[PDB]
């Protein structure tokens, strides 16, 4: 009976966490050693 | 779309350089300076304009004029944040290139760094990066010092061992200016919109002056047709075809008929005012046109190339007055 | 199709399916599983299910659309604060 | 009389957005203009106390979002109806995005103002009049949110 | 561009989910599960109504504050050499401040017509009540977003007029007519906004 | 009568007729009026004459105004769903084309006045192009009125 | 009859017929109209001869208007679902290909008028490539008509 | 008979065969049409010789038009789901590979025409690469037919 | 009276977002102003203990977020209501994101201030005043979190 | 038989094998076709000799062609869901790997023909690199042939 | 008494996010400061063992995420309640993404702080004072992760 | 995250090592701290897999 509640806390959490991986992984991929 | 921004960062400085445009001497301002007869009367009419009280303390007119446009240019660079501070750095590279060739000459002939401060242009100057001040080494251990300077990426066509007298002193300026004009075109292509159609027409004609003035003076010289080919900037309207026919020229009319393929550069070959006085009036026609567009970075580079015309014209008025030869005094460039 | 739900209880708490007409009702009930079919039964077996579950319920489907509304207001405000460089030289 | 249990989410979210979006704008007014104080003070160091006028006008934007956030948090209650809770969410966006807006307006004008006031002192009364018209936009965020929260 | 890749990396991705979520609802049989009726009915008529009051004033002043800083940088920019601009060209600030008045006049009007009720069923919440809900959202949308666009309109022209008046004093009274047609769109916003809330009543 | 949610699409059509036409009148006046103050400094004679691109762009704004008056008065509590879908596309047809006309006006209205400052022979041709940009705003109006009045 | 929301697709077929053809005709007006002013300063003779791409951008605007008023005449309450999809594919195909023809006109129409100021030989070759940029919009029309009759 | 939504996919096959082929035809004409201007300013003799890239981009348009009248004439009320999904993959195959083939034409069109301007020996080689660029549009067509036969 | 199984998520997220977003502001106030200490040190190394006033006031933004983090965690129980847990969520966002903004403002004026303070030390009585106006922005997010979470 | 919706995945195996393989073969022609026109100014002798990457990229298009007809010939009304997934997995394995081989041919085909003009000893080695950049699509065949036959 | 089947996903996702996001902070703290050590060692090779204090204070941030990972993973069992499981998810974000902030701030002031040390060795006693307030942000995020996971 | 730190300081470290070999003892010492982040990856993974 808690299907929305699962899609509440599994979809937007995994994408929240997916980003803060990618935007962080982007920020270390091209750094400036110069 | 790229116009409701750019006043976040460059709102105040844009209205500043428009205010400094009004300090340019107009046509009516030019007429009263022709009527002068001595340098003291030249001092009086310039006090009526925006220049006033700058001669309170004929070759001093050369220095006291151009020192005003340096401090006006340095004041603009102190407030541009990041979208413009690199752009104003690109205008100084044309003066840093003319400075560094002046410096490798005294380096080659063992004339030390004491001659650097009074005999260089203050726009492109060396008052930071203190490694260049110490270097007296003959042009091979100094190139390793030279790369701690923003002219480093332009030296990627300058081999260090090619510097030691195998290349002429003048040739290394033009192939550095060739490396300079390709980068400043590509940097102005990375920026888009209003600064990409008001600035790049100026850089096309500036590369095409370096197409014509090179080959018209490369006739009696013993530099071959492959040397003047790579000294052409691959930038302007003449790139795929006009650069090819300029290499095989060998004659004054053979550079004219290749300019007859373009209706802009013909009717400028009717100097037959000389050619460079006809190229200068078209150049200030383009810099005046850059003042039409508003939300773009090209208003700064158009200001500097017109401010150097202001210091050029007043001296030419003064040289016709001090030498008392004012039958050619009307051969100035009336920019406004 | 056939309906199927998991809680078809009475005792309205937030969103239970059964509601009485009068609020302090004497009767209450609960179906901890459920599947009912009418009007298209074949072969003495149920058809495909129509669940009550849903990816979205109308509580999470207003709260998302307001949270996604003012995340976007934030990412306009955060974009401008993330873009004010200072100058390099001072005079 | 009793509403749904998730009804109090929106008035709480209206209380936070009244303080998040107001502080984001007021931090822009203190940073963008406060950077211009540093570039001004090297050449003209006398008008340093005179130029905290755009900074203090950005400070009123912060307390513009604070007062309404107090009035919403005092009006919170268990089991508020959906009409009551949504009235404060619309109250929060009215004061929040206005303070985020007028936080930018004091920021850019106060930056360009104190850079120009140092080279001409006559622009000071002109600069402070534009900042009045910028900061009064934050006052328009109040008297719609004060009407909405009281209703 | 670094930060633009985030929004253009999400908008392509979110549309790519909603494309393939779209050809998997029709392709099985599950279009009955979509229910745009259940989305517009079961949520609330208050979520649309109370957002419209908020977007009425807030999106107007985010054009009004946008209109100020575009020409306010150009006032003080040209004001360094020509200090006479600070008196004449303040009407460009007013026309990009009177747009904020068009919001706050409208925002009190839309909040004057919102009233509670007791129903919780979309058949009990009649079509007299749901239509009252969306109309506050739509009228709040068109007085907010249109004032945003006319706010940036008079500001950009106001920045150009501050630069043109720095060179010539007689020009500013001629370019001021352009700011009238820019600020006329703010007048065109509020006429729609009252008209969309004319026949509206909650309860 | 119609369902309870039916009036939503008529309301969204009433707003979208106004906002997208307001966006066209915004860029039509801001991008072009930047060129008008640009033109006035070097040639202050055509300043009162070249305000025709900022007044044609004003007609884009009243194009979205009339269909907003047409639709929002035709609203009622609980209209039929077929009548409301027509008013939704009535708002989009005049709005996005009025949005398209503003990008057409502001580009050629800025480009025309710069050549006018360099050579005033363009002025007969520049105003002719602004007619062709204005029928784009005009074509959106006649599709909006033939859709909403059904 | 059909479902209630069936007419929503045929309304969106009427809107996307107009707003995409208007967006195509706008860019073909804008990108070519910028090239008119750059040509007219140096060669002011060919200024009414150079407005061949801007009227050829204008024919893309009437191409959408033919399909748009055709759909609004065929709209009716309770149209079947198969009838409404056909008008959606009609307005989409005349719209987006008209947007393609509007993009194709503006690039070579600008490139043609930048070259004809430099050489009069291109003026016969410029109108050739503009025709091939115009028949793309014509191909969208003849398939819009064959999709809306059925 | 088939379901009510089945006719939507076959209509989408008719439009996507058109607009995706039109986008490739527009881009191939525009990208190579810019090179005709830069070639003409020095070598105006090879004007009629340089129309062969832009007409081979025109083949991509009629490749979409051939498939579009095939899908539109096989349309009927109540077609089966197996019938409609065949037509959707038929429209994507000619359109998207035609979008690819139109992209490959315009790149070698811009490079080859500028290349044959400096040296006319490239004209027998430039037309060779364009043939391999064109035939990718034909590979989409022949699989668009055999999907639409069944 | 008892809450549902998932109702404790938001007050957990309230204690999380109060510490995460306030730290990212406290990080930027240290990071952006820490480069300002480095360029200042090569010219005027006398103002080093004087110049750490931006980096300590950035750290106050973290302990602003710390004291509301443990205050929310002290009130956590199993089976709390939605109204009680949303109250801690909006308390968390109003102190973390407003602290994130106040952390942004200190880092910019901290960078611009200490570089001008080396070239002219008269700025230090004015630079420290703009940072107070930037810090009190963080204090505005504190007193709304305390008036939300405790009630 | 199977379900009614099963044909859509087998269609997507037939179409994406022809889109993506022709999408890579277009890029391999376009990127290397620029390299042909760049060296033809200085070195006009190697034009017939240097079109090896263009005809190697042409095999990538017929790689997608052979698996498309082999899948389309297996298409029946109401095929099983296990059979249709095998054709989608086969079509993705040949198209996207061909899109990879279209990328790898295009880069070294561009850079290699820049070097073979200045030094003709690269001509043995440049085609030797291209074999490894071509067999990647050939590995895509023997997985697509083994999957569609099951 | 017992929890549902999907409950242990959130406690596991708190265990990974405590270790991942602290390591990405420990990456940027080591990497950005590591280039400044290589930039210093060309001219001033003496401060090469003294200057590894940013890369060792960035190492503490990894150990901050380590202990809470073992704290979370040792409380795991099937039928863990949703109140207990969300506490571990609220733990791991509050130590990882806050340690990511302290990881970002250490590498910035560590890089610039060792650039000016080559031109001014007096900065070395002041640079470590800046790095303390950068590293203490991970300490605040640690103790809130413990007070959330001990429950 | 471990290979990101090894990649950056391994890049700039071997540049300065050729210009001055005194960095080589210090370059490894930072590289150990860059590598044991992955070693903390084990003792969370190994402590979770055996449950
Ligand atoms: C490109 C890659 C993306 C690829 C994506 C591929 C995903 C396709 C899988 C769909 C298959 C499911 C299916 O068969 O239908 C099912 C519906 O389920 C759905 O189709 C919809 C589920 C997703 C909607 C959630 C919002 C997405 C927003 C995304 C935003 C992201 C933004 C990120 C930035 C059938 O439903 P049912 O028969 O009623 O029974 C099950 C439902 N029940 C249990 C609840 C009752
Ligand atoms: C990352 C975190 C992402 C989190 C995504 C999860 C969002 C939904 C969470 C709870 C969903 C839920 O269960 O609904 C509940 C409340 O639902 C709400 O109203 C909560 C809305 C929270 C929005 C997120 C705030 C973030 C703020 C950011 C702003 C930045 C500035 C109510 O449940 P119900 O559905 O009404 O009851 C029906 C019963 N049934 C479900 C059994 C049928
Ligand atoms: C699911 C699938 C998702 C895949 C989607 C897209 C994949 C592609 C992703 C690329 C993104 C790169 C962004 C980036 O470069 O860093 C950005 C920082 O960004 C931030 O400041 C943080 C933003 C917070 C977002 C939180 C999401 C979750 C919210 C709940 C900006 O970088 P920068 O430091 O400003 O430097 C830019 C250089 N420049 C200034 C010259 C322009
Ligand atoms: C990259 C992105 C790819 C990742 C995607 C991941 C999605 C995987 C989730 C599938 C899980 C089961 C979903 C499902 O309903 O099964 C269904 C199978 O249908 C499929 O499973 C087809 C999968 C659709 C994927 C489409 C991607 C193709 C892109 C090219 C079975 O449906 P059913 O149970 O028979 O109910 C229907 C009954 N009814 C017809 C009576 C209504
Ligand atoms: C990227 C974006 C991905 C996110 C997209 C979509 C996410 C949507 C997932 C919705 C799951 C619904 C199923 C559900 O109700 O709970 C189920 C649990 O299932 C889970 O909770 C597993 C959580 C999945 C996250 C894994 C992503 C990691 C991929 C990273 C790879 C790198 C059921 O649990 P239960 O205890 O058995 O309850 C009894 C139910 N029963 C009676 C039916 C048996």
Short mmCIF file of N, CA, C and O and ligand atoms in Angstrom, two decimals, chain A residues 15-16 18-20 22-23 26-27, chain C residues 71 82, chain E residues 1-3 5-6 9-10 13, ligand 3:
data_model
loop_
_atom_site.label_atom_id
_atom_site.label_comp_id
_atom_site.label_asym_id
_atom_site.label_seq_id
_atom_site.Cartn_x
_atom_site.Cartn_y
_atom_site.Cartn_z
N UNK A 15 18.16 10.21 -7.50
CA UNK A 15 18.59 11.23 -8.34
C UNK A 15 19.16 12.29 -7.59
O UNK A 15 20.03 12.84 -8.09
N UNK A 16 18.83 12.52 -6.36
CA UNK A 16 19.53 13.57 -5.64
C UNK A 16 20.97 13.20 -5.48
O UNK A 16 21.86 13.82 -5.90
N UNK A 18 22.29 11.01 -7.39
CA UNK A 18 23.00 10.91 -8.61
C UNK A 18 23.52 12.08 -8.94
O UNK A 18 24.41 11.93 -9.51
N UNK A 19 22.95 13.25 -8.74
CA UNK A 19 23.67 14.40 -9.18
C UNK A 19 24.99 14.81 -8.52
O UNK A 19 26.05 14.97 -9.15
N UNK A 20 24.93 14.96 -7.26
CA UNK A 20 26.01 15.24 -6.32
C UNK A 20 27.15 14.24 -6.46
O UNK A 20 28.23 14.42 -5.88
N UNK A 22 27.70 13.38 -9.99
CA UNK A 22 28.13 13.80 -11.32
C UNK A 22 28.68 15.23 -11.31
O UNK A 22 29.72 15.51 -11.90
N UNK A 23 27.99 16.14 -10.61
CA UNK A 23 28.46 17.53 -10.53
C UNK A 23 29.76 17.60 -9.73
O UNK A 23 30.64 18.44 -10.01
N UNK A 26 32.37 15.86 -12.17
CA UNK A 26 32.75 16.86 -13.17
C UNK A 26 33.77 17.83 -12.60
O UNK A 26 34.71 18.22 -13.30
N UNK A 27 33.62 18.21 -11.33
CA UNK A 27 34.43 19.28 -10.78
C UNK A 27 35.86 18.81 -10.50
O UNK A 27 36.78 19.63 -10.41
N UNK C 71 12.37 24.76 -5.95
CA UNK C 71 13.73 24.43 -6.33
C UNK C 71 14.18 25.26 -7.52
O UNK C 71 15.32 25.71 -7.56
N UNK C 82 26.37 32.08 -7.62
CA UNK C 82 27.52 31.30 -8.03
C UNK C 82 28.29 31.93 -9.17
O UNK C 82 29.11 31.24 -9.78
N UNK E 1 30.55 26.25 -21.72
CA UNK E 1 29.58 26.44 -20.64
C UNK E 1 29.58 25.25 -19.69
O UNK E 1 29.46 24.10 -20.12
N UNK E 2 29.73 25.52 -18.40
CA UNK E 2 29.71 24.47 -17.40
C UNK E 2 28.36 24.29 -16.73
O UNK E 2 27.85 23.17 -16.65
N UNK E 3 27.77 25.39 -16.26
CA UNK E 3 26.53 25.28 -15.50
C UNK E 3 25.32 25.13 -16.41
O UNK E 3 24.28 24.62 -15.98
N UNK E 5 25.31 23.16 -18.90
CA UNK E 5 25.27 21.73 -19.20
C UNK E 5 24.44 20.96 -18.17
O UNK E 5 23.96 19.86 -18.45
N UNK E 6 24.24 21.54 -16.99
CA UNK E 6 23.41 20.89 -15.98
C UNK E 6 21.93 20.98 -16.35
O UNK E 6 21.21 19.98 -16.30
N UNK E 9 21.34 19.17 -19.46
CA UNK E 9 21.54 17.75 -19.29
C UNK E 9 20.39 17.11 -18.56
O UNK E 9 20.21 15.89 -18.60
N UNK E 10 19.59 17.93 -17.86
CA UNK E 10 18.43 17.42 -17.14
C UNK E 10 17.19 17.51 -18.02
O UNK E 10 16.38 16.58 -18.07
N UNK E 13 17.21 14.79 -20.46
CA UNK E 13 16.99 13.53 -19.77
C UNK E 13 15.56 13.36 -19.27
O UNK E 13 14.98 12.30 -19.49
C1 LIG M 3 20.09 11.68 -14.09
C2 LIG M 3 20.95 12.14 -15.26
C3 LIG M 3 21.65 13.47 -14.99
C4 LIG M 3 22.71 13.81 -16.04
C5 LIG M 3 22.57 15.27 -16.45
C6 LIG M 3 23.61 15.97 -16.88
C7 LIG M 3 25.00 15.35 -17.01
C8 LIG M 3 26.02 16.46 -17.25
C9 LIG M 3 26.39 17.16 -15.95
C10 LIG M 3 27.43 18.26 -16.12
C11 LIG M 3 27.30 19.31 -15.01
C12 LIG M 3 28.57 20.13 -14.79
C13 LIG M 3 28.30 21.34 -13.90
C14 LIG M 3 29.58 22.06 -13.49
O1 LIG M 3 30.46 22.18 -14.27
O2 LIG M 3 29.72 22.58 -12.20
C15 LIG M 3 28.84 23.62 -11.91
C16 LIG M 3 28.61 23.73 -10.40
O3 LIG M 3 27.33 23.24 -10.11
C17 LIG M 3 26.86 23.55 -8.83
O4 LIG M 3 27.17 24.57 -8.32
C18 LIG M 3 25.94 22.57 -8.09
C19 LIG M 3 24.51 22.48 -8.61
C20 LIG M 3 23.58 21.72 -7.67
C21 LIG M 3 22.71 20.67 -8.36
C22 LIG M 3 22.09 19.62 -7.41
C23 LIG M 3 21.19 18.55 -8.09
C24 LIG M 3 20.33 17.84 -7.06
C25 LIG M 3 19.44 18.84 -6.32
C26 LIG M 3 18.42 18.12 -5.45
C27 LIG M 3 29.39 24.94 -12.45
O5 LIG M 3 30.77 24.83 -12.65
P1 LIG M 3 31.69 26.18 -12.43
O6 LIG M 3 32.48 26.05 -11.15
O7 LIG M 3 30.77 27.38 -12.33
O8 LIG M 3 32.70 26.36 -13.72
C28 LIG M 3 32.13 26.54 -14.98
C29 LIG M 3 33.11 27.33 -15.86
N1 LIG M 3 32.61 28.64 -16.26
C30 LIG M 3 32.41 29.48 -15.09
C31 LIG M 3 33.58 29.27 -17.12
C32 LIG M 3 31.35 28.52 -16.98
#
